[PDB]
Symmetry: C3
Subunit: 168 residues, 3 copies
């Protein structure tokens, strides 16, 4: 049998796991919100401060959080509306300070002005993120993905874009 203290110890471990899972789901939510909102300084706070990290998605690789946000600010300019919509996470806490997260991504991109005016891009991907916990806080260290599909097309210029946060 188990004493009351043993049962408390078990509960403490279980609750810590659930708390970590929830913290990670909110971290990834914040990442997507900052990414699509183009809130680059805030997005930087989701990335690990441990610069032993190579900040990579398996394709693109950078050596600091600032390098990541400098790339993104250039790659995702005001003329590009983006939606990165995460679904159905599978978060595994791997240790006291490491974890893995599978996410099912849908992405939609719309170029409103410039050289790529009226280009639309839609896709899907399976991401597997790696996270680390530093001084009580979870951060994103790196990821990899399989692209389910991606399509590029020209949007009808007669479509009426009635709202655009990057103009308003």
């Amino acid at each position: 049998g188990m004493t009351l203290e043993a049962r408390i110890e078990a509960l403490e471990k279980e609750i810590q796991r659930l708390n970590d899972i929830e913290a990670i789901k909110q971290l990834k939510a914040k990442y997507f919100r900052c990414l699509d909102g183009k809130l680059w300084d805030e997005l930087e706070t989701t990335l690990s401060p441990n610069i032993e990290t190579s900040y990579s998605d398996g394709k693109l690789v950078f050596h600091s959080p600032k390098e990541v946000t400098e790339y993104l600010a250039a790659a995702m300019p005001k003329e590009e509306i983006s939606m990165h919509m995460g679904h159905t996470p599978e978060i595994t806490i791997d240790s006291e300070n490491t974890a893995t997260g599978r996410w099912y991504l849908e992405d939609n991109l719309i170029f409103t002005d410039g050289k790529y005016k009226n280009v639309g891009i839609n896709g899907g991907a399976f991401y597997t993120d790696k996270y680390e916990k530093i001084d009580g806080q979870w951060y994103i260290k790196e990821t990899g993905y399989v692209r389910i599909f991606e399509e590029h097309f020209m949007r009808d210029p007669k479509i009426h874009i009635t709202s655009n946060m990057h103009k308003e």
Copy 2:
């Protein structure tokens, strides 16, 4: 050090928080399901019964749950298929009976008949909801949002809508 009783107290607070977070995520799920299903009486049960509430999204404002559902029933008639798809919540429990929830919304609207026949509307938004807990149950009090984008367009009438719950 902490006694067993102190450790139990800590666990009770942590579990209550996680339970509240889960209750809120299910509440918002029910809201979207009732909204798109046009189950207006059921949707009304998700809204706070505290009529000190101004029921607002920052744009539209009503003074009771019934006023909200009367508006929605008129604004979202049988001829309008709607999908409001929530993603990546960030739920913060603010007190014993208040909370905040960020949600990443995609919306798709299709008009099948009437004056707006063949109109499609797609968009995205960042919502920040406010919730309150009354007699053990969570309710939605009000929200605000930033529209990421919105587009209006005419759908090809050659598209075959093979299923529509609002006709069947």
Copy 3:
């Protein structure tokens, strides 16, 4: 009042419920990932091994997990890109080893080659799943759904599909 032991018992029940809810959300995530990835052997591991189960969605009915995956492999061939995107779950744990889960589905299907080349199908549905727990593990037993809508259309062959995991 409650003794420390009673308070521990209450916490054990609450944490087990939250653990079950999280296990179910990850189970359904795995189902969708395997479905769209066409990982049929892995998908089979999400289905209940209890063959007193009729494996049904209310429309299609099979009598073993293998029959389910044989159907799916034929129905969802390499020429069909699929995305089944789950949102906003409402998971109810019904007993120590049974549960119910509402899911808000968006589906997108694209045929790239064959007889249905350039067909696209988009839809939405409200699913209510039934789960069972066998030897510590949750499985999907069966489901039912209401189709919000479904549309069939021919895609412009000028669209550029730049990535497709089922060719790569």
